[PDB]
Design an enzyme around this catalytic site. Structure first.
Site, PDB file in Angstrom:
ATOM      1  CD  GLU A 105     -27.544   8.479 -28.948  1.00 55.62           C
ATOM      2  OE1 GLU A 105     -27.554   8.391 -30.138  1.00 55.62           O
ATOM      3  OE2 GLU A 105     -27.124   7.516 -28.193  1.00 55.62           O
ATOM      4  CG  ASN A 152     -29.813   2.337 -36.498  1.00 54.40           C
ATOM      5  OD1 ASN A 152     -31.166   2.264 -35.983  1.00 54.40           O
ATOM      6  ND2 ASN A 152     -28.999   3.217 -36.346  1.00 54.40           N
ATOM      7  CG  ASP A 185     -31.134  -2.794 -37.588  1.00 58.00           C
ATOM      8  OD1 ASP A 185     -31.327  -1.762 -38.027  1.00 58.00           O
ATOM      9  OD2 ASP A 185     -31.459  -3.381 -36.385  1.00 58.00           O
ATOM     10  CB  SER A 243     -33.978  -0.334 -36.641  1.00 62.96           C
ATOM     11  OG  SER A 243     -32.484  -0.146 -36.279  1.00 62.96           O
ATOM     12  CG  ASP A 283     -31.201   5.073 -33.882  1.00 63.25           C
ATOM     13  OD1 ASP A 283     -31.659   4.034 -33.340  1.00 63.25           O
ATOM     14  OD2 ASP A 283     -30.008   5.309 -34.584  1.00 63.25           O
ATOM     15  CG  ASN A 334     -33.070   1.097 -32.933  1.00 60.04           C
ATOM     16  OD1 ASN A 334     -33.463  -0.114 -32.784  1.00 60.04           O
ATOM     17  ND2 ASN A 334     -32.370   1.403 -34.154  1.00 60.04           N
ATOM     18  CG  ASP A 379     -34.263  -3.942 -21.731  1.00 57.84           C
ATOM     19  OD1 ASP A 379     -35.268  -4.280 -21.439  1.00 57.84           O
ATOM     20  OD2 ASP A 379     -33.649  -4.248 -22.343  1.00 57.84           O
TER      21      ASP A 379
END
Ligand code: CL
Ligand code: CL
Ligand code: CL
Length: 129
Positions: free
Chosen positions: A35, A46, A48, A50, A52, A59, A101
């Site tokens: 990562e 990203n 979209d 967003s 990280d 994110n 989650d």
């Protein structure tokens, strides 16, 4: 801060990540390697919109607030900047929520693609832990 491999393993263990939700320490170190290359200051934008953040590339769509991700949540209740600190506490606490989650470490696409099913113990080999 760019952590050493064993240094990060020790810090993660210190913060209770070792075997958290059944994921051995090598899984977490491997995820961080791919990562962020162990760099707490890593950021990546990203498609979209967003972003990280940090050693585990957490994110802003769901987990932290950066003020510039429309329609997003802040489920870890932290500014995304907290995920860039030399102190990994915020990243670890948030990672604990993420991995709980529902999909385990598959939440980290890079863990799924590069760590899952591999000899992850290699990542902590030789480490005084
Ligand atoms: Cl391991
Ligand atoms: Cl936002
Ligand atoms: Cl990947």
């Amino acid at each position: 801060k760019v952590f050493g491999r064993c240094e990060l393993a020790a810090a993660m263990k210190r913060h209770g990540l070792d075997n958290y939700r059944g994921y051995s320490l090598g899984n977490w170190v491997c995820a961080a390697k791919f990562e962020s290359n162990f760099n707490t200051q890593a950021t990546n934008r990203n498609t979209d919109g967003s972003t990280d953040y940090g050693i585990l590339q957490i994110n802003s769509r769901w987990w932290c607030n950066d003020g510039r991700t429309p329609g997003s949540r802040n489920l870890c209740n932290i500014p995304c900047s907290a995920l860039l600190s030399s102190d990994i506490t915020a990243s670890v606490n948030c990672a604990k929520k993420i991995v709980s989650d529902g999909n385990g470490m598959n939440a980290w696409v890079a863990w799924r693609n590069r760590c899952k099913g591999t000899d992850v113990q290699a990542w902590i080999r030789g480490c005084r832990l």
